[PDB]
Design a protein around this ligand. Structure first.
Ligand SMILES: CC(C)(O)C#Cc1ccc2[nH]c3c(c2c1)-c1nc(N)ncc1CCC3
Ligand code: NA
Ligand code: NA
Ligand code: NA
Length: 288
């Protein structure tokens, strides 16, 4: 599936360059019909664990939500599976690292948190957990209408948590997401819930504002789990707005079964902005 420059998919999508890879590969391609560039994500037709089909189903389920890429097309063929979707821009991990001290201002952090919370509530509203919420899976828009909006990417680790509602949890479930942002529950092999996506958001926002997490330099997953289990998470909030204590206590109180109080978390962000005079139309840090 290493497609050369000027390769053309279904007589419509002309590959320009590889822009991601691993699971599968991601290409920037030109849509020969609509004449915009698009993101073209491919999965080898021989690779054993085939998840691109569920990624498409979640992406279709989310069409019409904010912070979701447009679905453009998909196809299954003898060599690879693919999905074509709206192309987005810079991801939040790269944007954070390009900041002079590797931190965002509280204005950018809080306003990003509002959008990421909206994204998470959206995928949960269609019956799925993301299970890999992290800053490289959010990308800012690249159009006049979208450049102040971030977009949720990569449903490859998603799991449906409804049956037809809340699905019976497995007694012990394997963890396969990203260690740095994973909740304690994910580390302890508990079946993941909506609250564990919100834990990842909590950790992301602390890292945005403080610039690091205490276990960042430990790559042993089991060690990181024990560190998080023992860590006094209120220490994470020493230089955060005090409303974040509300967010921490809420998600700490949740189990697999209980619907999060997304509105409570949104009000943490909204109240934090009001206390500080932060306005929704402020420049983001990367805007010059
Ligand atoms: C189908 C779905 C929703 O599950 C997915 C996914 C997806 C997984 C991995 C990815 N890596 C990159 C991207 C990406 C997307 C990416 N995607 C888009 N649309 N624009 C720009 C980029 C930036 C280049 C890096
Ligand atoms: Na043109
Ligand atoms: Na861009
Ligand atoms: Na965009």
């Amino acid at each position: 599936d290493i497609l050369p420059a000027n390769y053309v998919v279904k007589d419509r999508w002309k590959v320009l360059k590889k822009i991601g890879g691993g699971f599968g590969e991601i290409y920037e391609a030109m849509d020969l019909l609509t004449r915009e560039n698009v993101a073209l994500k491919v999965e080898s037709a021989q690779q054993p664990k085939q998840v691109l089909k569920m990624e498409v189903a979640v992406l279709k389920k989310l069409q019409g939500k904010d912070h979701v890429c447009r679905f453009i097309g998909c196809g299954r063929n003898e060599k690879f599976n693919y999905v074509v979707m709206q192309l987005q821009g810079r991801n939040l991990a790269d944007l954070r690292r390009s900041q002079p001290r590797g931190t965002f201002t509280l204005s950018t952090t809080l306003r990003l948190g509002k959008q990421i919370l909206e994204s998470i509530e959206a995928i949960h509203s269609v019956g799925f957990l993301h299970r890999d919420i992290k800053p490289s899976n959010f990308a800012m828009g690249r159009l006049p209408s979208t450049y102040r909006k971030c977009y949720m990417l990569d449903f490859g680790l998603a799991r449906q948590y409804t049956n037809t509602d809340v699905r019976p949890p497995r007694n012990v479930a394997g963890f396969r997401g990203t260690v740095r942002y994973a909740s304690v529950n994910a580390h302890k092999n508990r079946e993941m819930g909506r609250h564990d996506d919100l834990w990842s958001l909590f950790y992301m926002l602390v890292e945005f504002a403080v610039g690091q997490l205490p276990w960042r330099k430990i790559k042993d997953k089991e060690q990181v789990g024990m560190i998080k289990e023992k860590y006094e998470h209120r220490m994470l909030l020493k230089h955060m707005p005090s409303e974040f204590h509300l967010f921490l206590d809420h998600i700490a109180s949740l189990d697999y079964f209980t619907k999060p109080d997304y509105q409570l978390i949104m009000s943490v962000f909204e109240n934090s902005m009001k206390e500080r005079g932060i306005a929704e139309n402020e420049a983001f840090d990367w805007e010059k």
